[PDB]
Amino acid sequence: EGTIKTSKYEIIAIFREELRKRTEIEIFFNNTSIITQLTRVDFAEFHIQTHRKIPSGHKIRFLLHSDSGKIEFNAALTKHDNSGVDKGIRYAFSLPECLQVVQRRRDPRFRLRAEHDFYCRGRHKNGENYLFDIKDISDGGCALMTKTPNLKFLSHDALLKNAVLMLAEYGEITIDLVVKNVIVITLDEESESYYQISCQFKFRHLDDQRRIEKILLDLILEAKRKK
Ligand SMILES: Nc1nc2c(ncn2[C@@H]2O[C@@H]3COP(=O)(O)O[C@H]4[C@@H](O)[C@H](n5cnc6c(=O)[nH]c(N)nc65)O[C@@H]4COP(=O)(O)O[C@H]3[C@H]2O)c(=O)[nH]1
Ligand SMILES: Nc1nc2c(ncn2[C@@H]2O[C@@H]3COP(=O)(O)O[C@H]4[C@@H](O)[C@H](n5cnc6c(=O)[nH]c(N)nc65)O[C@@H]4COP(=O)(O)O[C@H]3[C@H]2O)c(=O)[nH]1
């Protein structure tokens, strides 16, 4: 997909459904990117808080992880305050007059939490084991986690054969995964960083694809219920 938003109204309406929803905002600068949240939004500014530092005087790049899809834009630092014995800096930016929304997924990706000890586990070709945490999951694949991948066997379109989804109370399914990307991700003592592996399912049998559909359905049901 592809769509551009200009309306001053849509923009702040969007910056508030995402403040309220406490959704992740990723900021680009130096060389890496930092993930965090909005803390304030008004008629001209939005605020975030990080203990890092950012190139004043320059339109830096932002990106919102929204349920509506990827929302990209560029804004310029306007203010910055310094406080606390534990240094947490307060940056105030300007509202972009231009956004961009991209949503190319024909399947909603369910996000895993504390009550979900989901793992993916296997053995590479060299005979070494891996064990990834599952971060999210859909009918067509999953986004994995690890601090110590073997970057070698995780080449674009490389495939983890005879992997085994360990889905806890749902049991274990044996699948093939196709690696679509490998990325490093950073959150913020606790300044974090792990590798996200983007995976596409390659089903061994067909019941496999159905059993996952039913499972993911049961996760979405406990999602709306429970809380
Ligand atoms: N080739 C490929 N890579 C995947 C796929 N899913 C996840 N990735 C990778 O995993 C990174 C993080 O994905 P995310 O946490 O969902 O965080 C994403 C997501 O929140 C949002 N986004 C991007 N595209 C979409 C989309 O099509 N639909 C939705 N709902 N959000 C999107 O923007 C965030 C950053 O996007 P990226 O910079 O590209 O960084 C992406 C991207 O490199 C996939 O299906 N195919
Ligand atoms: N739960 C989960 N599923 C994954 C992941 N990576 C791939 N998949 C699955 O693999 C399919 C194909 O991914 P793609 O070839 O990169 O083909 C994708 C990709 O080109 C692009 N795309 C989607 N999300 C992202 C993203 O976050 N970042 C970037 N750069 N591209 C994305 O849109 C194409 C269609 O996206 P989908 O319909 O969602 O179809 C996706 C999706 O069903 C993952 O990390 N987690």
Side-chain angles (χ1 to χ4, degrees), residues 163-208:
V164 173
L165 266 35
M166 316 191 62
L167 307 176
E169 336 106 51
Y170 302 96
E172 301 177 339
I173 311 189
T174 308
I175 336 78
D176 290 23
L177 313 186
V178 182
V179 182
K180 288 300 177 179
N181 193 357
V182 163
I183 219 194
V184 179
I185 280 171
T186 297
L187 318 150
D188 74 42
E189 174 68 346
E190 169 265 26
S191 308
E192 189 169 342
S193 194
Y194 53 87
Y195 289 50
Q196 196 162 310
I197 293 98
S198 291
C199 284
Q200 165 173 269
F201 291 155
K202 197 177 187 181
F203 300 97
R204 295 186 59 168
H205 307 254
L206 289 192
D207 203 331
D208 285 12

Side-chain angles (χ1 to χ4, degrees), residues 63 65 69-70 102-105 109 181 183 196 198:
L63 181 153
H65 301 266
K70 174 173 84 177
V102 249
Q103 206 293 343
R104 342 164 225 198
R105 300 179 204 163
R109 287 168 187 169
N181 193 357
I183 219 194
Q196 196 162 310
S198 291

Side-chain angles (χ1 to χ4, degrees), residues 59-84 86-215:
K59 266 180 175 285
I60 68 171
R61 189 171 75 99
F62 295 77
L63 181 153
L64 294 173
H65 301 266
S66 84
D67 293 352
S68 71
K70 174 173 84 177
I71 300 177
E72 184 172 347
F73 70 89
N74 301 273
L77 194 152
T78 294
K79 270 58 220 158
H80 74 55
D81 155 287
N82 355 266
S83 291
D86 127 87
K87 201 62 185 302
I89 322 185
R90 297 179 5 170
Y91 298 159
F93 299 68
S94 70
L95 288 175
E97 310 89 344
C98 172
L99 296 189
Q100 184 171 357
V101 178
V102 249
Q103 206 293 343
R104 342 164 225 198
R105 300 179 204 163
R106 304 297 134 217
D107 266 69
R109 287 168 187 169
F110 180 72
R111 182 78 160 253
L112 272 57
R113 302 314 193 170
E115 59 275 334
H116 300 114
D117 89 342
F118 295 18
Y119 300 109
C120 182
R121 155 272 291 219
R123 204 182 297 274
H124 288 303
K125 179 200 173 70
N126 72 338
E128 96 182 20
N129 285 332
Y130 50 83
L131 179 76
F132 303 139
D133 312 293
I134 304 180
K135 187 184 185 186
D136 69 41
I137 182 165
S138 79
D139 294 87
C142 51
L144 304 174
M145 266 184 302
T146 184
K147 297 200 172 192
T148 171
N150 196 349
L151 260 191
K152 178 182 182 175
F153 303 82
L154 301 173
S155 10
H156 185 290
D157 273 336
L159 65 108
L160 299 326
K161 337 184 60 72
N162 311 324
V164 173
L165 266 35
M166 316 191 62
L167 307 176
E169 336 106 51
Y170 302 96
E172 301 177 339
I173 311 189
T174 308
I175 336 78
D176 290 23
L177 313 186
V178 182
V179 182
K180 288 300 177 179
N181 193 357
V182 163
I183 219 194
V184 179
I185 280 171
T186 297
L187 318 150
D188 74 42
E189 174 68 346
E190 169 265 26
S191 308
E192 189 169 342
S193 194
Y194 53 87
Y195 289 50
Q196 196 162 310
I197 293 98
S198 291
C199 284
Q200 165 173 269
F201 291 155
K202 197 177 187 181
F203 300 97
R204 295 186 59 168
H205 307 254
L206 289 192
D207 203 331
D208 285 12
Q209 174 161 38
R210 172 186 50 188
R211 170 61 176 156
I212 290 188
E213 291 187 354
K214 279 47 190 168
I215 284 176

Side-chain angles (χ1 to χ4, degrees), residues 8-9 14 31 58 62 93 99 137 140 198 214 221-222:
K8 197 87 74 27
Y9 295 94
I14 287 180
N31 276 270
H58 187 278
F62 295 77
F93 299 68
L99 296 189
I137 182 165
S198 291
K214 279 47 190 168
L221 187 31
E222 291 284 355

